[PDB]
Amino acid sequence: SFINYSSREINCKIVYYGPGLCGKTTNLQYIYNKTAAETKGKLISLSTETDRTLFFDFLPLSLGEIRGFKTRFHLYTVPGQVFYDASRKLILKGVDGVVFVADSQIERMEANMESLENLRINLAEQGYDLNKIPYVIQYNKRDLPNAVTVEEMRKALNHRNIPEYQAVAPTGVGVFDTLKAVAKLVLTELKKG
Ligand SMILES: Nc1nc2c(ncn2[C@@H]2O[C@H](COP(=O)(O)OP(=O)(O)O)[C@@H](O)[C@H]2O)c(=O)[nH]1
């Protein structure tokens, strides 16, 4: 997190992680579209011929102050192509909370398992433990007929039983529950050491 003493703001970064086409862009799009226009900044997409990154920040107009400071949240997706790992590392630097978006399709489970490990390693490179930091997992695409049961997705992707949420991101099911969960964990950490 970054404390700005001029604007009296605690800036926090939340990174949506996961394999290609799992639903990160959709999560951030739905969050942005439902956020009050006076509290959010510009939604910015950085695209190439093969990949993209989406990010924006907002000031939750609910949400009390912490020692006089208001909290600003910056949401980032991560690129999905194998050759942008450096970018992913750069986006994870200084992360405060992480959401892992899992594609519940059986044909993507292996992909999920890869991305998860890629998250772990990357955090471990910067000195942090995925099990110790604010972190929730989202089982997305529950509407699809090839969606894996929650118990098997948990056996594969959430063996230490961190908070998990089921979602159909295009319609908005589970999106704001996930966001609220990871934001609550981040704020609890902010009110401590
Ligand atoms: N049926 C279904 N489709 C989804 C869901 N979430 C995302 N999609 C679709 O999956 C495709 C990839 O989603 P996107 O957010 O762009 O993936 P990203 O690479 O992780 O950002 C898009 O065409 C979405 O419409 C879901 O929960 N259910």
Residue numbers in the entry: 2 to 194
Sentences from the paper on this structure:
A hallmark of all motile M. xanthus cells is the accumulation of MglA-GTP at the leading pole where it activates motility, while MglA-GDP is found diffusely in the cytosol. To gain insight into the structural landscape of M. xanthus MglA, we determined the crystal structures of MglA in different nucleotide states, which uncovered that MglA can adopt three conformations: inactive MglA-GDP, active MglA-GTPγS, whose structure had not been determined before, and an unusual conformation combining inactive and active features.
Remarkably, we trapped MglA in a mixed state in which switch 1 is in the inactive conformation and switch 2 is in the active conformation, an inactive/active combination never observed in a small GTPase before. The nucleotide-binding site contains GDP and a ligand tentatively ascribed to inorganic phosphate (Pi) with two partially occupied positions, possibly arising from spontaneous hydrolysis of GTPγS over time. There is no Mg2+ in this structure, as its binding site is occluded by the retracted switch 1. The observation that the mixed MglA conformation observed in the crystal contains GDP and Pi raises the possibility that the MglB-refractory MglA species is a post-hydrolysis intermediate resulting from spontaneous hydrolysis of GTP into GDP-Pi. Several lines of evidence suggest that the MglA-GTP* species identified biochemically and in vivo corresponds to the mixed inactive/active conformation seen in the crystal: (1) considering that all known crystal structures of small GTPases bound to GDP-Pi retain the conformation of their GTP-bound precursor, and that the mixed structure, although it contains GDP-Pi, can readily accommodate GTP, it is likely that the mixed structure derives from a GTP-bound MglA species with the same mixed conformation.
